[PDB]
């Protein structure tokens, strides 16, 4: 139910699994 994509964009930019 994301009202827009700003939060998603930030999260994806900050995400890291690969050390």
């Amino acid at each position, epitope marked *: *139910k994301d009202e827009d994509g700003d939060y998603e964009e930030l*999260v994806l930019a900050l995400r890291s699994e690969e050390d």
Partner: antibody
Amino acid sequence: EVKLEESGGGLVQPGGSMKLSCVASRFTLSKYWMNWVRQSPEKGLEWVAQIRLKSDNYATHYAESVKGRFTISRDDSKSSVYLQMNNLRAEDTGIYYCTGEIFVNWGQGTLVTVSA
Amino acid sequence: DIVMTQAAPSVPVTPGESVSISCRSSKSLLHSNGNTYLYWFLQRPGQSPQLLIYRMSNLASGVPDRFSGSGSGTAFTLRISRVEAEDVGVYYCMQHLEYPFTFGAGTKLELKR
């Protein structure tokens, strides 16, 4: 605005069990890692657990103090994350918060009191 | 275990003056990608924690001008240029470079008068 809401806390006997719930509104839960964080006067803020997405095979990580007793889970279709707490100790007393992946969104918290 | 240390339990500020709040880690928080994996939070009394700063020096959305974050790899500083009354509460740093994520003990801001 995004809203996270915890429920399930209360008074519970030592060694007993209690399952916490966190439901998300205006928040596409399936896209984001979720965390549980707790707070007590004695220990401050403590990160408890995390669960990732269906695609990283719902990978979980736990605080050492909690490993083996707590289980974090999620149900994307119910827009919810859970914390199953078994063999509760007095140390586990505190306010339990649910948070999203980057700690912008926090619930109001639910109070867990472990005493006889 | 990365230990997060906030030396000052509390700090007094004259309203409208600046303040700095320190935090240090027992290990460098500098990720290989060049980013420093450090959060700053404010917890106003009776409220849930609220994010102020991510990756050591970035203002989170909706956070006021007067807040800034800086630091090296192990020493970090949160600064407020002109303390509003809405700024009082407890400030926490947190590292998410490694599991377990760990918090500092917090630094309580209080107004002078």
